[PDB]
Nucleic acid binder design. Sequence first.
RNA 1: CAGAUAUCAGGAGGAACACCGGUGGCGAAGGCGGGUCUCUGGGCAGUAACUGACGCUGAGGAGCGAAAGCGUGGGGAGCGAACAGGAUUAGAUACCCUGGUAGUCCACGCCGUAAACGGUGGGUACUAGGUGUGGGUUUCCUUGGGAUCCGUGCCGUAGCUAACGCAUUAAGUACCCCGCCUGGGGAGUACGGCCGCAAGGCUAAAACUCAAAGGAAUUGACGGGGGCCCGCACAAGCGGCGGAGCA
Lengths: 117, 156, 64
Amino acid sequence: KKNVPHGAAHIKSTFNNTIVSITDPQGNVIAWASSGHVGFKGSRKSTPFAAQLAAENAARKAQEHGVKKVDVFVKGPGSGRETAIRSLQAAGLEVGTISDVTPQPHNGCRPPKRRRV
Amino acid sequence: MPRKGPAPKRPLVNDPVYGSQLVTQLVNKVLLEGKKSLAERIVYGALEQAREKTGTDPVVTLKRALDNVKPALEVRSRRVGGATYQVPVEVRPDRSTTLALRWLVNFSRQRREKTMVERLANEILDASNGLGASVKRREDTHKMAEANRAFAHYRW
Amino acid sequence: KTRKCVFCSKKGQTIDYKDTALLRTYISERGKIRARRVTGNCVQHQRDIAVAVKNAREVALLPF
RNA sequence: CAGAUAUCAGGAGGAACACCGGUGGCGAAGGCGGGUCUCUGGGCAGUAACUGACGCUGAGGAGCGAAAGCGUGGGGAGCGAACAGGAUUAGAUACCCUGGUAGUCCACGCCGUAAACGGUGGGUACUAGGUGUGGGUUUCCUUGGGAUCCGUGCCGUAGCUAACGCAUUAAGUACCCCGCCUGGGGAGUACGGCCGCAAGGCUAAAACUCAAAGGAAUUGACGGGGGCCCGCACAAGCGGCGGAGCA
């Protein structure tokens, strides 16, 4: 295989789930673990417990590829931001730095309209 | 009288034979509701039985057992947002002592010796050494209060 | 703040877009813009500074 | 599952400009906000320099004029009517998801209706204040403060309103002019007419119908409204019942 000394916790933290993609500094997701990856789907995909489970599974894969030092790259808001953060902290990946990597269309494109249920 | 502040409690005297508050609280908890002198005799004989089977002062042995059973975090039954989110709360010394002694009595009456004198003595021994039902329940409650730390910051 | 201004009251000072340091004193970390009354300055200076900050973001000298 | 999500980099696309962004301005009103350039709109302020009553209103008439929609040619990344499956449901056509066509954008056009409302026509002379607040200038301390003229809020005098409220930015006090209504539906409907590719709108009654329709305000029941709270109500401990016989 290979070893990644420093990783990046690219957390696609959708309210649906926190896809914790660990990425080498090159910019390649060496592995990822989401709520479904642990086994959480539907509402359980969006439960806070799924967040630390996904983060911990990703960090276990990180150790499996010898990853210890990771800076945290959290995407948009979801379920279990700080939860996945201290999961990664408690799973062999120290926090390093936290960065809210969220897209900012500064009054740009048009989305769908809305939901009323 | 809740909703108005701390509730005043009935004071507890020490045991006449032994002279310890924990002993008397254990007496009142092993006290089958209706008789005390016979319950006092039963807890007595249990404490002497623990004495020869340990060779030490029964009050100190009971203190060691209570320490080996006293909890530190308690879980209430608050309903938050229609979902059962467990919020651990630090236990005051009196509440933790009461919980430990209640567990000790409940698992004492569970044992299958000839008399609850023997059952309570064996429960005291199994809580002092750390091999009884009370000790394993103390372990399990702390394990479950640590497994749900994500809900521990609610501070209620 | 709470003065007449730092320009309309100090009665000597200027604003330049090339003076990116002076403008940066009023911008946020990313470059976000203070409200019309945050810095306590006379309004015309606020509006001109806002337009200058727009131009600076366009010319790539401030954190946008 | 082919490498979807993701991550990085790149390219393409189309649309809009978050933060500034608010009684703050501008504009006759619809409206105006990424930046640059060009042309242009109007207002306010201090000098009367000047014209020397050239004032106002304004029926007809004039254009402008939200969005939609249609004509013509493009765009379409996304959204997205209409239309597609799935989902609650007795039924979904609906709320929810799974997509997307015209439209939505542009160019040139059409139409003219919106709750196109200070629900307060245009203009002008008087009637306590106070306080935010944009532009200006002056006058008074050593920027500080005052005055003034114009924009723009709220409260509050007189006085007015049925009350609600207006209250020097009137609905108070006066003039002059333009527009409108004469109880409620049937009705901005028939018909004629007018303009319309189309669309519609403008102009618009009547038969018939009822003894009402309505506005302000008062007391009540009504929230998945809140607040203050209190109740072995819950949080907690204990005895338990529901399992069995018996009454």
